[PDB]
Amino acid sequence: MKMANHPRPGDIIQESLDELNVSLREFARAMEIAPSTASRLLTGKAALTPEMAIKLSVVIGSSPQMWLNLQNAWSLAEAEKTVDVSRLRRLVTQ
Numbered sequence: 001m002k003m004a005n006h007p008r009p010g011d012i013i014q015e016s017l018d019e020l021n022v023s024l025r026e027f028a029r030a031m032e033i034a035p036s037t038a039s040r041l042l043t044g045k046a047a048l049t050p051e052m053a054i055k056l057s058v059v060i061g062s063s064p065q066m067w068l069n070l071q072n073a074w075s076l077a078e079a080e081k082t083v084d085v086s087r088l089r090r091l092v093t094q
Contacts, residue, residue, distance in 0.1 A: 001080055006073035010044040016060050031055050
């Protein structure tokens, strides 16, 4: 999968923090999460979960689904490497 148009969830969050002039620990405090948890989220060492999507919607903005959409692109790219659809065919009315 070409990721050219699929930004890293963590990068988008960091980009937002840069525009707001907010530090990692201030972001962590605002999200009521530990600094370590915030770091993993920003660096991508931890996937953006539904729980995090809800918190991000409040603290940063946009909707929980928007944040999950960002993560789905990468989760889909990973799954693609392990899923075999080479023999699958679209079902038609029987």
